[PDB]
């Protein structure tokens, strides 16, 4: 309950900055359910980190079991998909999958390739996956 009341001596020590108009009802982020890369069958939850495709159940039994190649291919379930955090607020077509660890902004592939973070000085900044970001806040 930290609240402090301030009083200033001269009128020059205060400057207007903005009037913010704010509503009261709650409202939450875009939690999309993708369909499949092949089938459009089931409310989709499985993801392959290697080949970036949100492809639960369906044809994974037949298109991801071919040789010693396709057998390893970890199949991280339970909607642990980097392509599910909402749109980019500048570009409303792709999903937020990368996050900046210097300027700390949420970037979709369009928002990092020709986005605001595609400048010359914004090149050496580390860019981890967004699921790596959320697990980091959980374990401190």
């Amino acid at each position: 309950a930290y609240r402090v009341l301030y009083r200033l001596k001269r009128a020059d020590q205060v400057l207007p900055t903005a009037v913010l108009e704010f509503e009261m009802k709650p409202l939450r982020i875009q939690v999309r359910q993708p369909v499949c890369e092949m089938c459009e069958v089931l409310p989709a939850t499985l993801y392959c980190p290697a080949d970036r495709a949100q492809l639960c159940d369906t044809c994974d039994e037949r298109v991801h079991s071919a040789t010693r190649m396709l057998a390893r291919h970890v199949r991280v379930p339970a909607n642990h998909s980097p392509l599910q955090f909402g749109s980019c607020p500048y570009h409303p077509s792709e999903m937020i999958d990368s996050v900046c660890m210097t300027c700390f902004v949420a970037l979709c592939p369009h928002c990092i390739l020709i986005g605001s973070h595609s400048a010359a000085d914004f090149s050496e900044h580390p860019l981890i996956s967004t699921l790596d970001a959320y697990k980091m806040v959980m374990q401190d």
Binding site: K25, R28, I29, Q30, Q33, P43, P89, T102
Partner: protein, 101 residues
């Protein structure tokens, strides 16, 4: 600067020669969104929003709070409920019709 400079120039910070800091580490698929706000009119009020990827959520006070739905009884005289003594009242009356076909 980033991780690159703040690790090699701040953990050591120009010091040296005897310090040695420590070690380094139904219910199938429909394309329709299952809306979070369970007002049937919540996709039909507004979107006053500078950002775009942002549906509604029900307020904790005014209509109803977020809940599982364990209670929520219908109207008592309607026969779409668990069988009350008022609903099983006509169990020993025998409303079954004679013949209409």
């Amino acid at each position: 600067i980033s991780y690159e400079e703040t690790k090699a120039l701040a953990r050591f910070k120009g010091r040296g020669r005897e310090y040695i800091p420590p070690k380094l580490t139904e219910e199938t698929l429909t394309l329709v969104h299952h809306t979070a706000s369970r007002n049937p009119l919540s996709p039909f009020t507004e979107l006053h929003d500078p950002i775009e990827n942002r549906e509604y959520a029900d307020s904790w006070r005014c209509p109803a709070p977020p809940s599982l739905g364990s209670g929520f009884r219908y109207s008592e005289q309607s026969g779409l409920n668990s069988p009350t003594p008022s609903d099983a009242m006509a169990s020993w009356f025998k409303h079954k019709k004679a013949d209409e076909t």
